[PDB]
Amino acid sequence: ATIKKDKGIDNTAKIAKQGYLYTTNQRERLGVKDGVFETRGLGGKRIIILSGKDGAELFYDNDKVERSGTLPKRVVNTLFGKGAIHTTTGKVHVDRKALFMSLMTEGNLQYLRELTRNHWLMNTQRMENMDQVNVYRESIILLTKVGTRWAGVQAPEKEIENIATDMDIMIDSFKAIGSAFKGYRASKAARRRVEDWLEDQIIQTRKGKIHPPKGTALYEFAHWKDYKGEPMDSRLCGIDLMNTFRPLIAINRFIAFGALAMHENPVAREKIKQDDDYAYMFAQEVRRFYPFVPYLPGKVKEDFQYKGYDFEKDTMLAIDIYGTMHDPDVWENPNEFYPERFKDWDGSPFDLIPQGGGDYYTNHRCAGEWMTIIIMQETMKYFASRITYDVPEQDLTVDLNSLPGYVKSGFIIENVREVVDRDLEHHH
Amino acid sequence: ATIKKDKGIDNTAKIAKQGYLYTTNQRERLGVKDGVFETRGLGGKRIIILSGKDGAELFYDNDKVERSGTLPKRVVNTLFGKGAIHTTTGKVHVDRKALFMSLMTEGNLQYLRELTRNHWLMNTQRMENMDQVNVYRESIILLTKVGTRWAGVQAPEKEIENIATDMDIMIDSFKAIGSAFKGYRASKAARRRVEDWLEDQIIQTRKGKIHPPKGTALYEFAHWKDYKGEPMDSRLCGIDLMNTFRPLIAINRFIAFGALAMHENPVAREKIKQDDDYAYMFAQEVRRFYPFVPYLPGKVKEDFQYKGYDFEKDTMLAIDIYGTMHDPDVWENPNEFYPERFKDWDGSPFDLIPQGGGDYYTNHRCAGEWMTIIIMQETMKYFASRITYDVPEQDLTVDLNSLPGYVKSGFIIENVREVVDRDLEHHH
Ligand code: HEM
Ligand code: HEM
Ligand SMILES: CCCCCCCCCCCCCCCCCCCC(=O)O
Ligand SMILES: CCCCCCCCCCCCCCCCCCCC(=O)O
């Protein structure tokens, strides 16, 4: 056939202005029904947007799609860092992706679970004594302590908020989807400050001056050698060591979304309390329902055909992350928050894709998915059952046209109080 | 018969100089074998020292023994505070003892267990970053945070060590067993500072200005009324509210003893790791084996006879706490540290008496025994299995002739490192 087209020499600024609704706005407008359409952006480039489970499966087929060299360069410069694993391909990628996955052991993840639970439990008194708590800001300080500890890197108390704020600026910086913007240079400065500190950690580890525990990211990254037997240079080593816990800190976006989901859906709170499996499904439904990753780029590796369309080598592609996750043919009632839908989920690698799809070892899928689910499950259990609080009057708006997805207020709470059954006697 | 006697117009200074060994030194010397002997102290007063399970049972018989008015008045002034529950008798005592026991709910004790576990888990990084850690000092700061939280009283971070040090001075002050001493006035000042702060907590609770959680000591004590319908005056209320968590902080003495027991007995460490029930028995054996309470005073309520001796009304008595617990006819091999001995223990109220014997509700037995066992069990599990450390060269001496029992160094440790199995994969 002939791919339907959003016309224009370059629709980059229209894509940015419409945000997470851009792709579905065009599909509805043009009546496309096989989840393929075309547009132009990033300086007049032809871009084919894929959606749906079959779109996702095609996008993660290493015979059809090539990933390297498709990320806009200002996004690399602020989100991932130059030379980062996201920018690698072929043998080099599978080699280094193996390093990242070797941190995802059952024992390291259980450590991560305990760190998250104890940091929340210990943060209760501090939250009780504040007048108001911005969950999005509070999460990000808490997660910075958890993630620095989990990675084996040193962050004394007086650096924590510095590091948090710098983390917050880097995660936010994908909003320009390749453009320079107000904050581009502030984001590069935050990246460099943190990169410097992690490169120094690496160099002190290699020189025997500090001793991170075996099995932590800092230890393993410092002492790793690639398949040619070479270690990563100290600067690239710090860059990829940061890709180990900057995204961890970014879970604060989902935590704010989860607190809002519980507020908009009071039944979900009582049910998180009563059942750990609902807490898991609640966290999965937060990652499906709320906006974070809009789409991801790649390009055609060699010519192929798909649903009757011809795909030409080096034509730019994009997998629609948000749109696939709100496609009614993929998720019934896609704009209702309904965690129980995961009772019926078959665990496909191609429909729950908020952090990528495909295969962790041979695709570019998020290495931290399991870590993300563990942290969200712990945090939501905490908020549902360990504390009670008031949600004051505030702007809880989530503007789907603005990247990135945020609760406008950051979700404020007040009158936090720990939940302790002190009159439970053994007669009860 | 005729009670054997340590002769002297007054042997107070000899009792003090010999410490936890005084009673057994005299029994061996005089060949007593029914655990009764006599001496003079506290200004020429006749004192009959009882020991053994039958000594303990007699001492806690409310028909034979009267407790009120027997504690030396400088000990009341520094340890317990004037008007304290320890100084009450009859209906007034059973009434107020019921208040204290109503805090010992299964739900409040599980709260206490969680507080202890999470505070230790969170303290690991701080200990890892110190060069050396004095376990006795570190415990006492940690326990101050736990006990203030558990009691529902406010202690901001910058008061914690102030409060700790003041707690430490008050617990230490029973060493003069009635005498004025170097530090008497320093101990009264620490008592008054803490009493003032707790009386203010009480008054702000009654006036509705602060809102402690229902079921905490602060809430229950503030709002309690006695059997005549009267609440405690605010100053006495603070005094007895302090008897709710100053002794909790005093568990730091046992914690230091427990760390030393693990060091002197390496097998006990591996066994605490492998089994929660050994951890319980280890904590019980620390309370039996190491010196803390030497003996407690009372007096004869009405005339009676016991093992052939005549007991005259108002004759002063003392139950030998340390000596009963190291009597070979009560504990086989009483000076070997052997936790497994509690496999054979029948739970008698009269032989494991490191915090009193008899009945919690109608005797003056420690209201915080269960709390003490919970804290010791959690703390010993932590030290045995969550961290590893070095024990440097130091004076680990426990001078049994000096009240109170201390590890001379406070038990120093270094090179603390959390224990995390990060290479545990699900194949293992
Ligand atoms: C919690 C700890 C996390 C870790 C350790 C982590 C780590 C990583 C790494 C190393 C990659 C690159 C892997 C590769 O190139 O093969 C990646 C990719 C990615 N991550 Fe994460 N991440 C975490 C959390 C998150 C969060 C909260 C999000 C939010 C949406 C996220 C979204 C993504 C996306 C969209 C990709 C790209 C997938 C693709 O290119 O196909 N990650 N992550
Ligand atoms: C952990 C929290 C603790 C609490 C809440 C607590 C509380 C109390 C209270 C309220 C009393 C007076 C009860 C009455 O007069 O009827 C008492 C007595 C006593 N406590 Fe504790 N205590 C704790 C820990 C300790 C510790 C570590 C020791 C160390 C040996 C100890 C030793 C004693 C002794 C010897 C008595 C006197 C028993 C008697 O007079 O027959 N307590 N405790
Ligand atoms: C309509 C098609 C437009 C295609 C434009 C290509 C622009 C690519 C945008 C890239 C967005 C990446 C979003 C990743 C945010 C992840 C934050 C934490 C996760 C991590 O750092 O790994
Ligand atoms: C040989 C007979 C001498 C009798 C002398 C009577 C002197 C009485 C000494 C009293 C010692 C009390 C020891 C209590 C220490 C308890 C510390 C924490 C427990 C708490 O505060 O409840």
Author numbering:
A (entry chain B), B (entry chain B): 2 to 429
Copy the relevant paper text.
Although the overall architecture of OleTLA: C20FA is similar to that of OleTJE: C20FA, we noted distinct differences between the two enzymes. Significant distinctions were observed in the FG-loop region (residue 173–175 of OleTLA) and the β-sheet (residue 388–391 and 413–419 of OleTLA) at the C-terminal. The electron density in these regions, particularly at the FG-loop region, was less defined, indicating greater flexibility in the OleTLA structure compared to OleTJE. OleTLA is notably different from OleTJE and almost all other CYP152s in its heme orientation. Three tunnels of OleTLA including the main substrate tunnel pointing towards the FG-loop (residues 173–184) and the loop with residues 61 to 83 while four tunnels of OleTJE including the main substrate tunnel pointing toward other two loops (residues 60–71, and 80–83) were identified. In both structures, almost all residues surrounding C20FA are similar in the two enzymes except V76 (I74 in OleTJE), Y296 (F294 in OleTJE), I178 (L176 in OleTJE), I50 (V48 in OleTJE), and I16 (V16 in OleTJE).
8456. The enzyme can bypass the use of redox partners to supply electrons by efficiently using H2O2 as a co-substrate via a peroxide shunt pathway, enabling a convenient in vitro bioconversion process.
